[PDB]
Design a protein around this ligand. Structure first.
Ligand SMILES: Nc1nc2c(ncn2[C@@H]2O[C@H](COP(=O)(O)OP(=O)(O)OP(=O)(O)O)[C@@H](O)[C@H]2O)c(=O)[nH]1
Ligand SMILES: Nc1nc2c(ncn2[C@@H]2O[C@H](COP(=O)(O)OP(=O)(O)OP(=O)(O)O)[C@@H](O)[C@H]2O)c(=O)[nH]1
Ligand SMILES: [Mg+2]
Ligand SMILES: [Mg+2]
Ligand SMILES: [Mg+2]
Ligand SMILES: [Mg+2]
Lengths: 57, 168, 57, 168
């Protein structure tokens, strides 16, 4: 909770941070998709790598 | 170390209901209060005596945030049981039960043994889902039913025991 | 760029959004670590799943 | 389809320098302007004649945002060449070159053939790194040097050709 900036400034700051969350979300989705697409392959080929605890084969 | 049957079982249910702690409690006797949303897909195995037989239970877990995704087929592939879990203290997780049911009908084998599990029974003061209401729903839908607490362990063994014996 | 809220409100909004970016960052890191730890195993066991284009084995 | 040698080569360099497009250009003759930061680790292979010999070049790629991570050992394991890439239009990517060099010394085989590649030579109007300055640096440090453009293709073949023949 921290003063200094004008209402105008705090307001474009809010816009800039919204756009930044949008970019982070997109990145989270990209990461998620990559994980899922890689897991399909891991699952069909060497599912044992998904074991807990991990026994190297 | 040998065994008479290997059974693939999957955990499904809303994020936060305690799927991963039912897993760690069953397979490792461990519980974690500071438990993060499951990333990816994993499994852990445990052997138990059910009747005369030793059964390798191969228990699979993943995030329940999403319904259908690229890992979905592979996840249900070969699964002979599902534990379908809600949180007794969050009515929403219980509303979502039929949504998860459709998801099983759509992707699991038609003969999957499904058990309905109301988890977090330690939260008796915070209960949002009466046992009877869920009990009613389960029998109506051909499902075994049980309430557990991964936190204090109540019924966790019984739950896995029951589904595994009903797979036989 | 959108008015309505007091300076006080736009200001706790900014704080709420900062804390939200912090949570997204953390999640991005968790996703990244999971990827890296899974890739080590994929690499040592079945590196062919990382081929482009993907030939199922 | 058979071959006389299989050579593992890795791409390393700051994020954004064009590593993944040197890869797609070499292996598929494809270029993408809307190219996202590489997630994970991947490779693609290409066979080429170098002297009398056919060589499977197994080209590895990953994000250059991070320096050392869990995949790092496995990434350099068995690698006989590195293309160490900067962006001729971004002086910072070129400043980072010695940082990547230390990283090779630390994790790669001591006999890795390293080539220094200034990429994006199509951006002649935007040049931030004079060829001579980079040329100087490379020979001083025992490195082959070349400038490429994954976008228009200049030197991309020559770059892979050179490193592969110097691995022989
Ligand atoms: N009180 C109580 N808390 C529990 C119980 N089981 C799990 N929890 C807590 O509830 C939260 C979620 O538990 P998880 O095991 O991670 O649930 P999850 O279903 O696997 O979540 P997702 O991976 O996102 O789908 C954690 O904070 C756990 O500590 C329980 O039986 N009782
Ligand atoms: N003008 C020009 N742009 C290029 C060239 N090569 C790549 N680019 C562009 O530069 C950006 C980054 O290219 P990438 O191939 O993704 O670079 P990267 O090094 O692999 O990035 P990271 O995976 O994060 O480490 C993309 O927008 C490309 O289109 C080039 O030779 N000339
Ligand atoms: Mg979980
Ligand atoms: Mg699912
Ligand atoms: Mg890249
Ligand atoms: Mg690296």
């Amino acid at each position: 909770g921290y003063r200094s900036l004008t209402y105008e400034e705090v307001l474009q700051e809010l816009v800039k941070h919204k756009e930044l969350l949008r970019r982070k979300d997109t990145h989270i989705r990209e990461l998620e998709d990559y994980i899922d697409n890689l897991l399909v392959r891991v699952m069909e080929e060497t599912p044992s790598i998904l074991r807990v605890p991990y026994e190297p084969s | 170390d040998e065994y008479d049957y290997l059974f693939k079982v999957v955990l499904i249910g809303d994020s936060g209901v305690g799927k991963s702690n039912l897993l760690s409690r069953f397979t490792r006797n461990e519980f974690n209060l500071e438990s993060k949303s499951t990333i990816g897909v994993e499994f852990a195995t445990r052997s138990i005596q059910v009747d005369g037989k030793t059964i390798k239970a191969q228990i699979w877990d993943t995030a329940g945030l999403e319904r259908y995704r690229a890992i979905t087929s592979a996840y249900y592939r070969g699964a002979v049981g599902a534990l379908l879990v809600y949180d007794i203290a969050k009515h929403l997780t219980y509303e979502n039960v039929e949504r998860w049911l459709k998801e099983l009908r759509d992707h699991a084998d038609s003969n999957i043994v499904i058990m309905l599990v109301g988890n977090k029974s330690d939260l008796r003061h915070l209960r949002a889902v009466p046992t009877d209401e869920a009990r009613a729903f389960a029998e109506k839908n051909g499902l075994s039913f049980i309430e557990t607490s991964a936190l204090d362990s109540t019924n966790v063994e019984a739950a896995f025991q029951t589904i595994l014996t009903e797979i036989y």
